[model samples]
Structure formats: C-alpha cells, structure tokens
Target: ASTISVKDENGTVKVPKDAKRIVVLEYSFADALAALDVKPVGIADDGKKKRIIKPVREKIGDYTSVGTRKQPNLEEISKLKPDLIIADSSRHKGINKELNKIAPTLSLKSFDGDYKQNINSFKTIAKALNKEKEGEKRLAEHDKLINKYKDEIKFDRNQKVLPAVVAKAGLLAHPNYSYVGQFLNELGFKNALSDDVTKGLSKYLKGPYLQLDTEHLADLNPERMIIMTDHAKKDSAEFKKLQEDATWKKLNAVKNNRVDIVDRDVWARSRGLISSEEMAKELVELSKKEQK
Candidate 1:
C-alpha cells in the first residue's frame, strides 16, 4: 500500500503527497533526503565540519545553514519558506512548536540504539514525502547486501568484534546508544562497555569529557577499535596522540592495524536505507580485511 502508519512518542503528522520543499533539521534526516534525490533548502550546520553534506554539499552549496543542530536560528529558518521541516527529537526539543508556527513540522526521535529504528524512520519519512516505492527499493537493496555479508562472514564464536565507542577528541567515550554503537550493532558486533555508561547521557554527549588513561584503555582492550570521527581537528589530534602513546601502541589492534577510521557522517551519523546499504557493504569488506 502507498499509505503506511508512522508512530512517535508524541503525536503524528500523517504526511500526504502534498508535502514538498523539505527542510531537514537533523544530520540523519538530511542523509535520507539526499538519498531520495531531495535536497533540503536548508540544514543545521554540523559545527565540527565545513561541508557536512559530503555527497551533495556542492549541489547544496548555496543552501542556507540555519545554525547548529541544538540551536537553530528561527529567523533564518523562517526565510527558507519550507513546506515541511524534519527534525530529530534528541536535539530539537520544542522545535516542533516553533517550526509548526511557520509550517508542518515532523519531529523524528533519533534511533539512539537500534538499526531497525533507523530503517523504519527512513521508510516513514519516505512515505511522508510520497516516495514509498523509492523507500521500498532502498530497503530491499540494503537487506540484500546485509544478507550477502551475513552469509559470507564466517567468524569463530570466540572471535568477537568489539568496538570502544570514542568521540569528543578522545576525552570521552560514548555508550552504545550513541551513533557508533547503533551502527556496530547493525554489523552484529559487540560493545565492550556496559550499557549503563550512557544511561543518563546528555542529548548528543555534551562534555565534561571523561579522560581515558592508559589503565582505562587497557582494562577494556576491545578486539577492534572503531574510532569514530566528527571530522574535527580535535579528533585527529586525539587519535594521533593515542596512537603515539607507549601503552596504546602495545594494543593488539594497533599492532595489527585493526583500528580503522570510517566516515562518521556516512556510517555513524546518517540514518537511512541507502546509507545502510552502503555501510553494510563497507563494513563487510572491513571485517573481511581485518579477520583475514
């Protein structure tokens, strides 16, 4: 059927075909829009990077930036004259009320810890935009790629792929609810840290950064370290320093080069069926390269 049900904790918008001229207020939603060949008139700046829209940044180079995700400039947003504004619940609290004053606004709760939620959110947004067939195709392609990799990935039960979710310039590590953890789970990998680590994390891990000394790093010693980057200088510096450290240098992953840096915007931040397909394929390759 062309119509589908979409539910959030709050009310729903039941978006019909009339929806167009979209303005994506979240990174994940922006990726979804890009994948669907719908470029938003405007988006919130990722703050850490100049060109957040790597795929279509040049196409949308002239598009407006409505300030950071947490603090969208309402005045700037109103100028875009968007028919629909898509935002994430984790970062954009009370944004629906403000944006609804201008146009129909739909708030999507971030898929904090679930890959299934990511897929479903994309389907919902596609339905909202009257792109159900496109969504279904994307979902099908993603599922096919994941299934292919699942069949090929022959790992021993004991050969667990563990990721120590790091962000914020290595001053702190986020729990599995963060983007990296969700993506790892998508690849059927395990996280070495306790789930409780992110029980009370702030929206988007604002720091009071936690310091991980050599001892802390040694204690966890995950089999693999997927150092997620914000594409920031701090991330580079921290990653370099950690690699240079005598203690960190001795780790098995470091010695064997199991620690790889994946594009954060694509793999970690972006949420959608097409991106999932891309990510699942990329990860399958990485897993093969590392395991072999």
Candidate 2:
C-alpha cells in the first residue's frame, strides 16, 4: 500500500494512492475530480444537485449529497465510508481534525482563494488522487486552450471589459482577483474596475465580489460587460430592475449593445480545467459576436 504526498493549504498530508471512494466538500473540488477523471462517492452539493455544472455532472454521474458545503453532514460522510475527504480551507478549517477521524482529509483553498489559487488547488487535487501525469497533461492542454482564446479575441482599441455575476446579492462585480475576472485577463481584456478607480472608495468590498448598485456601477462605465448568471431568466426581477433603472441605461455596455450574458455555472462556479476550456470556446464566439 502506497500514498501520495500532497502539499495542501494545511501542511503536507499523505493521501491514499488512487483513492476511489472520495468525498468532496466544495463544487470546485468536484470539478477537479471530474477533470482528473475520478468520481467522488459523495459531495456537499448544498442540497441541490442542479448546482453541479452539466459537464461535471455528466462525467461524475450520480453521487450522494453529503449536505451543504458550509455544514457537510459528517455522519453521512462516515456512513459513505469514504477513503478520502476533500475539505475547504476557509470554510472547514475548524472541522479538519474531526474530518481526519472519518478518513484522510486534505484541507485545500476554495471560496476565498482567487483564480491562481484555484489552479494550484487543482494541481494539489490531481496529486492527492495520484493522477499527477494526468494533471500535467490536462494543465498543458488548459494553457494552450486559454492562449488560443487570448489570440482569438479582438481587443478593439483598448476597450474596457467588466465581468460580474448577477446574484441575489445584487450586481456583484468581479474585480481583478476573482476567478472570472482573472480568466478575462487570460482572454486579454482590460478590466473596467481597475485598482485606480477602486482606490477612490475604500473598505466594504471583500474577496472576489464587490457589491455594486446603479450609482457605483456608473463610475466604471465599462465598454463591454459579461454578466454570468444561474437559473434566473433575463426577465428576472433584478435584471428587470436594472433594465428600468436610470443609471443602468447610461453604461457604455448597455448603450453600445456590448453586454454578453453567459451561464453562471461555467463562468463563476466551475473553476477547473474542463470548465475553463469550455469557457474559452464560448469566449471566442462571444468576442466575435460583440465585434459584429
């Protein structure tokens, strides 16, 4: 019996080699598992199997819901008899010791961590599952695909682009550090919400998302906007309100018809290789569409 030495958010841990009975505590962890061609026995699906992106769901197939990501059901996880438990660093820090009793636990970064950290997490996850060669191969493919997207996009005389997720929390703008924001960087677009403009206002903003209203959004005035959303239709109340709002009318994206609404699952949620490639393809088409 052998193990893989994985350097996780919390010190190095020995993960069971080629772990089959895995339990993932975050959606992104499940994304990594699917990318590595390993399916977990259980997942903390936040009580909704619908949240699992279509590609990942199709690949991983059916899995038991261990409960919400924030509060995964430990008893259920133990019942599943998982050989490995992938937990989140920011959310499940206190429970690491407790999770260890159930199985070999690897506490890795998620949620609070940015795009770069997510990529690193994928690598750690690949090694943890003893799929290092597969990880390297996929990573190379990922880099090549992203570069292809960057090359295809037409910047159009330094057009400023904005990426945001339309959540119930309001029009939450993804700044430079967020996953989609960084991914937009990979596609070679200049973010409208640059550090200089953010310096004008202080505090309030946290992590990847900065909550924005019509008044605040007016300041950035992006040339193009990519709005990623889930479940809700374009006629949803929040979007409807934005449509009716006086300030929303003034955005360059709105005025020029350069706003591109895309699926929230791939853009914001699935932070892994497979999802990234999918997004890159969509982005290439989006770029051409916007230019047209």
Candidate 3:
C-alpha cells in the first residue's frame, strides 16, 4: 500500500494515503471522518454507541468498539487490522509505540476544546486520508452555518451568558477559551466570568471548565445561564435540589427565567463541527424566547 507522510501533533507520521479501514480512538476524530463521508471500521466508543452525537452517529453506520477511549483494547484493535489508526495525543501517546507496531498510527490533539485547532486537526486528518477537498468543503459549510445562525438570533453583546455542566462533584463552568466559549463569542455573547483562574494552570491542567460551588454562583451573576446535563439524566433530581438553594435563586438568570438546560453529550462532550451546529440550533431556540 502506498503511504504519505502527514504532520500531526506527533510531528511527521507516515500513513496509507488512501486508507480504507481506519480506526478512530476519539469522538472528535470520528466526527471529522464523518464530515468527509468516511466511516471508521473501529471506534473507542466506551462500550456505548449511543454516546456518539446524533449527526456523527448517523454517518457511522456500524463499527466495532475497541473499548473505552481511556484504555482501548489493543488486542481487539489489532484484530481489526486497520489501515490507519487515529489516536488522541493526550490519551494514547503513551501507547503510540504499541499502536504503531500493529498498524500505522497518527496521534493528534483531540478534545482540547480549541475550535481553531480542531479545524486544523480535521484538515490534517483529511489530508492523510486523501480527502483534502472534502475537508475544505466541510469547513466552508461550517462557516456558512455559523453565519446563518448569527443572523437568525441577535443577542446583546453586553448580555453575559454562562455555560456550565452539572456534575456529581459540582458545577463546571466553561471559560472563554473553551469550544463552547468560542461558539458563543462568535454568536456575540460575552462570558460572565471575565477572569478565569484556570489560565494560570499548566497545559494539561488547563481544562475547558472551572469548578464552582453553589455559594460562588452569585459571584458571576450572569444575565443568562445554560446548564448542561447528560441526555438520560436531564430530569435528574440534583438540578431540582440546586434550584431550591438560596444562592441559585439570587442569580439574575434564575430570577429572570433565563436559564436553559441543554444536552451535555452535544454541548460539553462532543466538541466537533456537527455538535457545534446542533449547539447553535439550541442557542437560537433559546434566544427566540428571550427576543419575545
């Protein structure tokens, strides 16, 4: 099989120029492949295919699960004998040598919550698969969609909005550097938390979110708040319990009825172009009610 060298986070990686059977170790890469109308033969789906967002899920017809993204079953992956393996640099870099022994592997920075980097990563992956034109087309379509959504929903740039995920530990707030922040910024909404402490953390420690307790919620006092919860646990009693707190009621968003609950799978977990489009749709729907 002919091979072409493509540059990723791991420097230069030589892979099949036209890979037929590919295995993706991350959801974002799977989403990128789906954008180019390419279906991976194997995916690290955490043993749950439904965990994949709707748009990407529809395109990936049937694929074997190599195990969880944290610990992919090398034995199962080797059995598939994929022409190429797309692994996440953070999650799979330690075992990349083992992966390469099985097949050609390309480690990329996936799920860093950086929108621009994600697009560039997609292009690099497409180039490796010999679908550069398709990648460009998808990126252009994404820009068009962003513009369309921006026109459909007009919000005051001064209005502060906070996007947070509800977890067993507490609330995890998305700072301005996150993928959700980039999307909301493109839509002209300002992040309520102007000063994010995570900025000072190391690269690995610098995550998309900032953990906040209920008592500290009022510190931001955002005009609007978007709460992200797992699809199945959307109606969980924990949210109700939180709402009953005095600190939660004191927030302007709660007082003005501007709090929206969104699907965590798309808004928080799946940081891809398709998921961004769906998030835009959700934001538009939420904005329509505010406009009225």
Candidate 4:
C-alpha cells in the first residue's frame, strides 16, 4: 500500500494512503472519520457504544470495542491488525509505543477543547486517509451550518451565557478557548466571564475550563446558563440537588428560567463539526422557548 505523510500532535508519521481498517481511540476522531463516510473497524468507546455521540453513531456502522478511552485493551486492538489507529495525545501518550507496535498511530490533541485545532486535526486525518476533498466539503458544510444558525438564531446583545459542566465538586465553566465558547461566539452570544478572569483567576486549573464553587457562581450571574450532566436526566435526583441549592437559585439564569440542561456527552466530550451543529440547533431551540 502507498504511504502518505501526516503531521499530528506527536509530530510527523507515514500512514497508509488508503487505510481501510482504522481504529479510533477518541470520539472526536471517530466523528471526523464519520464525516468522511469512513467506518472505523475498532473503537475505544469506554465499553459503551451508546457513549458515542448520536450523530456519529447514526453514521458509523458496527465496530469492535477496544475498551475505555483511558485504557484501551491493547490485545483486542492488536487482534484487529488495523492499518491506522487514531488516538488522543494526552490520553494515549503512555501507550503510544505499544499502539505503534500494533499499527501506525496518529496522536492528536482533541481534549484541548479548541475548535480551530479540532478542524485542523480533522483535515490532517483526512489527508492521511486520502479523503482531503471530502474533508474540505464537510468543513464547508460546518461553516454553512454556523452561518445558517447565526442568521436564524436571535439573541439579545446584552445577554451573557455560561456553558458549564455540573459535577459533584462544583460547576466547571468553559473558557473562551473551549469549543462551546467558540461556537457561542460564532452565534453572537457573549461569554459570561472574560479571558482576563479565566486566564488569571483560574490559572492553576488545566484545560479550557474554570472551576467555580456555588459561592463564586453568583459573581458571574450570566443571563443564560447551560448545565451539562454526564448521564443525569433533567428530573434526576442529582439535577434536583443542583436546583435546590440556595446559591444556584440566586443566579439570574435560574431566576429567569433560562437555565438549560444538556447532555454532557455532546456538550463536553464530543467536539466536532456535527456536534457543534447540534449544539447550535439546541441553542436556537432554547432561545425560542425563552421568548415564549
């Protein structure tokens, strides 16, 4: 098979120009492959195919699970004898040598939560898979969708929004560098917190998020809040606990009934074109509901 050179987070590597049997270790890469109509032969889906985003799950055919994203079953991956393996640099760096022994591994920075990097990584994967044209088309589609949503979705200029994950510890807010922040900015929604605060006050916290306790939550007081939960439904006890908090009740979003509960898998884990479009649609729907 012919080989193509590609650059990833871990530097340059030669990959199969026509890689048919691919194994993806990250959801975002799986989403990218799905965008190009490529089906991965193996996946590290945390032992649950349902964890894959709905849009990607619908497009991809069945595949063998290698195990969790943190620790994929190497033996199972070796059994597949895949020509290419796509992995998250931060998560799979320790096991990269082992993965390389099984197949050519492309390590990328999917968890950085940067949309620009996500698209660039997607394009790199496309080049390696010999689907550059298809990748460009899909990216263009993403741009068109963003434009369509921007035109259709109407939000008050004065309104400020916070996209955060609700955890047992506290609420973790997505910073301007995060995927949600970038998407929201594209739709003309201002982030509740400024970069100065996020970068200065939350300097110790890694990734594109700022951890805030209930006390600090009231200080931002965004006009709208999107609460992301791992698997908790809106009516779940965990969600109820959040609603019962005195600090949570004091927020303007809660007072105005503009707090939206969204799936963590889509809002937090999966950062790709399809997922971004879904988020945009959700925002439009939520905004329209608030008007009513």
Q: lDDT winner among the candidates?
A: 4
lDDT of 4 at 52: 90
Best by TM-score: 4
| TM-score, prediction 1 | 0.77
Q: Write the per-residue lDDT of candidate 3 for residues 182-250, one digit (tens) a residue.
A: 678888788886655335322323255677767667766788888888883556777777777888888
Q: What CA root-mean-square deviation does each model show from the true structure?
A: 4.7, 2.1, 2.6, 1.8
Model 3 error, position 43 (Å):
0.7
- Residues 69-166, candidate 4: write the lDDT tens digits: 98999999999999999999888889999999999999987876477888888999889988989988889989998889877777684788888876
Which pairs of residues collide in candidate 1? none
Model 4 spans with C-alpha error above 4 angstroms:
203-208, 235-238, 290-292
Q: Which residue pairs clash in candidate 2? A: none
What is the full ranking by lDDT, best candidate first?
A: 4, 2, 3, 1
> Of models 3 and 4, which has the larger TM-score?
4
Task: Flag clash pairs in model 3.
Answer: none
Worst 10 residues of 3 by lDDT: 197-206
Q: Model 2: what TM-score? A: 0.92
Candidate 2 local lDDT, 1-292, one digit each (tens): 6988878888989988857899999888998998888899999998988778788899999899999888999999999999999999999988888899999999887777777888899889887777889999988888987887778865572888888876543577888767777777767778887888666644537555677777777877888888887752477777877878888888888998887788887777667676777787887786676344
